[PDB]
Design a protein around this ligand. Structure first.
Ligand SMILES: CO[C@@H]1O[C@@H](C)[C@@H](O)[C@@H](O)[C@@H]1O
Ligand SMILES: CO[C@@H]1O[C@@H](C)[C@@H](O)[C@@H](O)[C@@H]1O
Ligand SMILES: [Mg+2]
Ligand SMILES: [Mg+2]
Lengths: 303, 309
């Protein structure tokens, strides 16, 4: 069987799988009390994509389609196309279009458009409210608010940049609250499962970034379960799993020594032996290395 | 056994990222260089994993800037004192052309400037443009200038980020006159030469042309030329950097394959210094299936004649 491996890039060389920004650090904390169920950055170790996960680091939280103006405001409805401008199929057995935001919050960026006939172009600051009633990406449409021009039947793109807040500080975004992908009073479908440590003394290990803030006092923490480069790697390699748990070691090349070890579960998430909230202190050139497949009762050395 | 076998990723063109701007690839393109010299500085990496020019590993940090800013109380423009991509101090004596990820073409790049005040976590963001052909574009010296749409609110001594979105055109009656993707900026200003560049590339074998990985940059105003060609997908850069497989000649023979059927559509040469050539004549958007991908066959000699494509 093809040997399993993980990418050897450092944390700072890899990308968050839930927003198009670099990873910055590793974090662990208790989460047994709440539900961890992100839909981007979900992939098994043998390469099966889950949830709304797709392969491009720059298409996360983007939208493409045509727009129509909502009379008496600066708001536009976008009729969604696929990530490569084909028709969007709402019957596919996924929660929402691939790359759809998987948290409730106000995402700010630029809405841009090109007119086919003459190549004229235009761009305006815009915000999408993923908690709002018109946020119905599974049905094929979302709404943007703008600050200011957009034509009908012309290709239009939202490029995300960051998040806003607008009361009590850091109350939004809520990175662990899923949007309602079909809107009010419709339950979500085909979700990737919630994850949690199943072994005593363990916690999830998160790959953490800080989202840019564009207004107010947002909570800018964003944790993903797998780097986007790991998703890309497992998808291509499709190496068979020889157990439910891949043991990884995090290595400091300056000394050759292992800093900590962790479990990469076959269904696509990492746990460590730690109790409490902890920002890991790592060497910037450290990397992860697969060492062996282990059984269900393997006890990690304390992180 | 022997040398580690060389490979390229199996991702399709449409699943990969442009190495010169943070957008997906769309198609393949070939043409003669014409009046321009092809010397891009992002997306430059040897097949055994040596990064060149301003190339770095993150697909989303391409054409970004980070640092602190200063206004003038008589203009909407801000000067940014540059830091490196992980907020480390940027040293102008480092042997690189400019901070890694700096734009490598002359044009007007629009995006958002954003900032967080460390003390209380207050944040702000405004549309901003950087003209990489302008005299204040001096990233090798550690500063660039941005024009913003509103008179002021950005604070001094606070971390500030530019996220690129697309390109604009203005100040011309001729459409699509800018950006000029093969004209390098003057990273220290026009009366100083650029340094430590990744070299220019060109087909060296009779009847061959460069093969490019092409995207269309978003346009944000005016009538810009939105074509953007790179020599290697960003995912190929990441792959070679990790694998560091030795090159066993100057040229790797690759085949481009349709996955739906497995059949070979054309063959090409991946030169060990990090660019691709094909046997073709003319300036053309290639007709390929969207899901096509490349596979390494063998290291070939310098006098190998490719089958025409
Ligand atoms: C509401 O205004 C926006 O948010 C505030 C908290 C400030 O950070 C201000 O500079 C910014 O423009
Ligand atoms: C100058 O104005 C900008 O460029 C023009 C060519 C138009 O596309 C217009 O919609 C856009 O706002
Ligand atoms: Mg340990
Ligand atoms: Mg051929």
């Amino acid at each position: 069987s093809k040997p399993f491996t993980v990418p050897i890039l450092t944390v700072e060389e890899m990308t968050n799988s839930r927003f198009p920004i670099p990873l910055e650090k590793l974090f662990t904390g208790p989460s047994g009390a709440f539900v961890v169920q992100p839909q981007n950055g979900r992939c098994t170790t043998d390469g099966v994509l889950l949830g709304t996960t797709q392969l491009s680091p720059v298409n996360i939280c983007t939208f493409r389609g045509d727009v129509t103006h909502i009379a008496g405001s600066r708001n536009y409805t976008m009729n969604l196309a696929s990530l490569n401008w084909n028709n969007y199929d709402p019957t596919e057995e996924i929660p929402a279009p691939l790359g759809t935001p998987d948290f409730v919050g106000k995402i700010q960026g630029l809405l841009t458009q090109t007119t086919k006939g003459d190549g004229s172009t235009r761009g305006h600051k815009a915000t999408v409210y993923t908690g709002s009633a018109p946020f119905t990406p599974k049905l094929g449409s979302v709404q943007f608010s703008t600050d200011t021009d957009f034509e009908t039947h012309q290709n239009t793109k939202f490029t995300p940049v960051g998040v806003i807040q607008d009361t009590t500080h850091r109350n939004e975004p809520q990175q662990w609250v899923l949007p309602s992908y079909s809107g009010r009073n419709v339950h979500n479908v085909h979700l990737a499962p919630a994850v949690a440590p199943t072994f005593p003394g363990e916690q999830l290990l998160f790959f953490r970034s800080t989202m840019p803030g564009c207004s107010g006092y947002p909570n800018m923490d964003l944790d993903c379960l797998l780097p986007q480069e790991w998703v890309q790697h497992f998808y291509q390699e499709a190496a068979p799993a020889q157990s439910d748990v891949a043991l990884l070691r995090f290595v400091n090349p300056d000394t050759g020594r292992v800093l900590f070890e962790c479990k990469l579960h076959k269904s696509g998430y990492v746990t460590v032996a730690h109790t409490g909230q902890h920002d890991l202190v790592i060497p910037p050139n450290g990397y992860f290395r697969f060492d062996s497949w282990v059984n269900q009762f393997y006890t990690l050395a304390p992180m």
